[PDB]
Every structure is written in structure tokens, then in C-alpha cells.
Design an enzyme around this catalytic site. Sequence first.
Site, PDB file in Angstrom:
ATOM      1  CD  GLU A   1      -3.166  -0.378   0.098  1.00 22.43           C
ATOM      2  OE1 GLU A   1      -3.163   0.660  -0.661  1.00 22.43           O
ATOM      3  OE2 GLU A   1      -4.161  -0.888  -0.011  1.00 22.43           O
TER       4      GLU A   1
ATOM      5  CG  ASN B   1      -8.195   7.103  -4.987  1.00 19.17           C
ATOM      6  OD1 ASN B   1      -7.991   7.128  -3.739  1.00 19.17           O
ATOM      7  ND2 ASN B   1      -7.286   6.381  -5.659  1.00 19.17           N
TER       8      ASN B   1
ATOM      9  CG  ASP C   1      -6.399   5.897  -1.248  1.00 17.79           C
ATOM     10  OD1 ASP C   1      -7.648   5.817  -0.720  1.00 17.79           O
ATOM     11  OD2 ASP C   1      -6.088   5.617  -2.270  1.00 17.79           O
TER      12      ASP C   1
ATOM     13  CG  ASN D   1     -10.857   6.326   0.070  1.00 16.26           C
ATOM     14  OD1 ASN D   1     -12.068   6.538   0.215  1.00 16.26           O
ATOM     15  ND2 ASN D   1     -10.172   6.494  -0.837  1.00 16.26           N
TER      16      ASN D   1
END
Length: 129
Positions: free
Chosen positions: A35, A46, A52, A59
Site C-alpha cells: 500500500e 483518487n 488515501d 481512504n
Amino acid sequence: KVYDRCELARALKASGMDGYAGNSLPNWVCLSKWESSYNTQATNRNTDGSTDYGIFQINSRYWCDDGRTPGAKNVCGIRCSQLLTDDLTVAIRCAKRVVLDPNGIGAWVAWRLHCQNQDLRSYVAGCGV
Ligand SMILES: CC(=O)N[C@H]1[C@H](Oc2ccc3c(C)cc(=O)oc3c2)O[C@H](CO)[C@@H](O[C@@H]2O[C@H](CO)[C@@H](O)[C@H](O)[C@H]2NC(C)=O)[C@@H]1O
């Protein structure tokens, strides 16, 4: 802060993540690696306007308030900025809340893709935990 793999494993183990909601330690180290590359300051914008945040890449549409995400809920009850500190306390606490939902650790795309069904022994190898 950019954590070392074993350094991260020790901090997770110390914070009660080994077996948290039935998710052993190697699961958590694997997801952190894919991640964010163990970087607490990682951020990713996003297409839906959400971002994130941190080592677990939580998120902003659902778990934290970053003030620029449309239709956000802030279930962890925090500012997303708190997920970027060197200190993992708030991040760990919010990650614990995320895995209690129905999807469990499947909430993380990187876990589903790179960790799910894999041999995760190597993620904690040589750490002594
Ligand atoms: C770790 C974190 O923040 N994970 C959340 C997350 O974050 C991301 C973050 C980045 C991506 C990227 C780059 C690509 C891609 O394809 O999917 C993503 C999902 O998005 C899902 C998508 O909706 C949230 O799951 C949704 O979250 C809440 C909380 O439990 C549920 O009510 C929904 O049911 C569930 N949606 C679905 C369909 O799984 C999950 O929480």
C-alpha cells in the site's frame, strides 16, 4: 517516517495487531508494504476526489476528514492528517476500526491483490517476533 520492515512488525505486534479480528501479523506487514512502501506520509489522490492516507492508505471517503472529499463519512472520527505521523497510534486505531466492517482485511485493494492467498512468512522473517 519510512519504517524498516522488522521495525514495523515489532510496532504492529506491540500494538495488538497480531490476530486482530483474526488477521495475523504477516497480513498487516504485507498490506503496508504494497500500500505505501512502509511510508507513513504516503498520499494518493483518487478519481472520485478521495485521497488515501498513510502506511495503511486509509481512504477519505469513508474513514477520515480531509475537508475536500465529497460525500465523506469520517467513521474513525479523525482528521486524515493524523494518519501521516511517524507515530502509528491513530493509524493503528483507525485500521482496527476498518477491519471490524463486513469486508474485513478485504477493504484493502493491495491486500486482495498481493497478499491474499500468498505465502506471507517472508514478511516477518528475521524480525524475531
Ligand atoms: C482501506 C480503505 O479506506 N479502504 C476503502 C477503499 O479504498 C480504496 C482506495 C484506492 C483504490 C484504488 C487506487 C483502486 C481501486 O480499484 O479501489 C480502491 C479502494 O475503497 C473501498 C471502496 O468503496 C471502501 O470499501 C467500502 O467501505 C465501507 C466501509 O466498511 C463499506 O460500507 C462499503 O461496503 C465498501 N465498499 C465496497 C463495495 O467494498 C474500503 O473501505
